[PDB]
Amino acid sequence: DTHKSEIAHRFNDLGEENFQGLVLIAFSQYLQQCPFDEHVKLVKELTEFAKTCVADESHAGCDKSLHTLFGDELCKVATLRETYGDMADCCEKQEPERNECFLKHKDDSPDLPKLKPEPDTLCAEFKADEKKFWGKYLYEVARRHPYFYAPELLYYANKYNGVFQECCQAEDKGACLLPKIETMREKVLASSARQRLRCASIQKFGERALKAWSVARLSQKFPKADFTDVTKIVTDLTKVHKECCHGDLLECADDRADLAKYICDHQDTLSSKLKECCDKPVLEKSHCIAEIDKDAVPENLPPLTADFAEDKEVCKNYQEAKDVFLGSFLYEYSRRHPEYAVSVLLRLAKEYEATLEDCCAKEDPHACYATVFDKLKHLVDEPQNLIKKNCELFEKHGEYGFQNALIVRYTRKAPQVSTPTLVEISRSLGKVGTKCCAKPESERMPCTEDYLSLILNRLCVLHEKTPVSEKVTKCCTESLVNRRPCFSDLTLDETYVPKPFDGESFTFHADICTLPDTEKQIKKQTALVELLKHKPKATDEQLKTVMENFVAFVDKCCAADDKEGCFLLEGPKLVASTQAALA
Ligand SMILES: O=C(O)Cc1ccccc1Nc1c(Cl)cccc1Cl
Ligand SMILES: O=C(O)Cc1ccccc1Nc1c(Cl)cccc1Cl
Ligand SMILES: O=C(O)Cc1ccccc1Nc1c(Cl)cccc1Cl
Ligand SMILES: O=C(O)Cc1ccccc1Nc1c(Cl)cccc1Cl
Ligand SMILES: O=C(O)Cc1ccccc1Nc1c(Cl)cccc1Cl
Ligand SMILES: O=C(O)Cc1ccccc1Nc1c(Cl)cccc1Cl
Ligand SMILES: [Cl-]
């Protein structure tokens, strides 16, 4: 809800620590290249202004919107001109256009330095000033992930500070904290990906897509709840995500906290797993709620055919109350299959909807849609062979070889895409093998659909930033939930025109020899992509031959006395072997 003085309302509701953290995340995400200390100064200003309005809400400016107050502060910054180019034209503008402009310049691949944990340095900053150290975490993560779910980031900052509580007085510091940080990293990065999808769903596919996703998710977590209660939570959760995805972080966090309280107050009718969550403080409580994945299927439920195929009013309901009805389908399907991937459940609803659009026009609709559930069950099973084949490949060759097989597959599909993006995405796809292939047989498909949804959304976000392939555009935009089928269906892109081999220009040198081992692995994956960009029709056996040659040449020359000399002499020999091989 809104108050006359929104700044006072949210300061009152959130309290000063969380208010400050949230405002710092806002500024970090709007202005990702700006330094920490400049952000801190604006947050302090606004905080101090907040306190003025709490004490006297009649004070000048206290009835301004949050965007006005945020924006005026962003426009103090002189360097907006230098550091952002045509974004200081946001500052030239006034609200509500200004805020929109700022939002549009969030950068999904800002290319800041890779963060590296240095235990002694970190421990000393923690000692010096814990609050600054917390703030610095919020800043560094937020600016790398400009749609990170902001109240979840506050929870993670508290966990981060806890790692250093534990480890800094420990004798051996890095032994204690490096693995903690590694673990936290993978969890934060997963969280950012799941939120980036949520935000894509609303931004690119509309509020109705986000509602659809929410009804499916919530029905797997709280399947014993009634539809009217699930739908209440959907309405609230949808408002929360809309706010967070739009950069309305103070409202997001406040509404989130209210929704956590509602959930906990109604825990007996929603899920027994809430018992672990509901006596925690707000941020941890909310995180715990988010972490719940599923409950048991309620006993004694009727077949879905009753409401969705037998009922004489199926067409009526589809026609007159379409959103409610598709919502009910989602709730009822989801609650019966709480282990399914959400994207699959949505894929089913979409086909159900398509079935009704075709059949409800006919003289005997029921004749036409009576068997729709059998078609849906088949749709669930469609990719089981290929998933099995993928997991068999992973088992036979391991993660790095599985990534290599994916580089080939994906480069053929989308050869226009940049080499760093093809490598990033293919390595992430290969990690799906490790995360999913030793799940129970029956849990593999939902595992792989879930991660694929996240990884392909990353692809699509990177592609939006600089579009290069009509086929990737098409798959990214045709339908959010059928992205995985779309991309799987793509074949070699014959639209692509390869540039010739720069046959006189040989491009590899002895500085490869000193790389850390994982960087040596990436260098070989980069080489593979480039080989495919020059000879996009090469066979698997050809690419293997050439890559084998390449790695023997690198090993031979990195072990030589004169290393660069070997690269220079034998490099031309490599190009010759390669040519003969790619005929
Ligand atoms: O304010 C303090 O006492 C500690 C401190 C030191 C350096 C930088 C920031 C902060 N605190 C702080 C932070 Cl970490 C973020 C936003 C607003 C404030 Cl006041
Ligand atoms: O490592 C990342 O890419 C982000 C990330 C997520 C969770 C925890 C830490 C980090 N990065 C990071 C590192 Cl590597 C060191 C010190 C402080 C930070 Cl925020
Ligand atoms: O729209 C809302 O705020 C919640 C609501 C309540 C009852 C029925 C449908 C909906 N929303 C909704 C919509 Cl608009 C589309 C697909 C799935 C759902 Cl749950
Ligand atoms: O791509 C396919 O045809 C099979 C398929 C279906 C559902 C989910 C994932 C996958 N494939 C797949 C798998 Cl199983 C793991 C890692 C990367 C990919 Cl592309
Ligand atoms: O030498 C280069 O990097 C460019 C070039 C020119 C002619 C023939 C092949 C290549 N590159 C090349 C070779 Cl020779 C082997 C494996 C991977 C690559 Cl990218
Ligand atoms: O030398 C080899 O053949 C192993 C190798 C090294 C670097 C890059 C790729 C490959 N192998 C390879 C190739 Cl070229 C394609 C698909 C799957 C695999 Cl394992
Ligand atoms: Cl949440």
Residue numbers in the entry: 1 to 583
What do the authors report?
Serum albumin (SA) is the most significant transport protein of vertebrates; it constitutes up to 60% of all plasma proteins. SA consists of three loose domains, that are almost structurally identical and mostly helical. The whole structure is maintained by 17 disulfide bridges, which ensure durability of the overall protein fold and simultaneously allow its flexibility. In this paper, we present crystal structures of three animal serum albumin complexes: ovine, caprine, and leporine, with diclofenac, a popular non-steroidal anti-inflammatory drug that is used in therapy of chronic and acute pain.
In CSA-DIC, a significant change in the conformation of the loop (500–508) surrounding the FA5 pocket is observed. The ligand molecule in the CSA-DIC complex creates the highest number of interactions. It is slightly shifted towards Ser488, making a polar interaction between its carboxyl group and hydroxyl group of Ser488 possible. As a result of its deeper location in this site, the ligand interacts almost with all the side chains of polar residues that are present in the pocket, but it loses the Cl2 chlorine contact with the main chain of Ile387. In the DIC2 binding pocket in the CSA-DIC complex, the change of Met547 side chain conformation increases the space where a ligand is bound. In the CSA-DIC structure, the carboxyl group of DIC2 is rotated toward the side chain of E548 and makes additional interactions with the oxygen atom of peptide bond of K544 and nitrogen atom of E548. The DIC5 of caprine albumin is anchored deeper in the FA6 pocket, whereas in the ovine albumin it sticks outside. In the CSA-DIC complex, the DIC6 molecule is localized in a unique place, inside the IIIb subdomain, covering the FA5 binding pocket. Diclofenac is bound in a loose and partially open pocket. The carboxyl group of DIC6 creates hydrogen bonds with the main chain nitrogen and OG1 oxygen of Thr507.
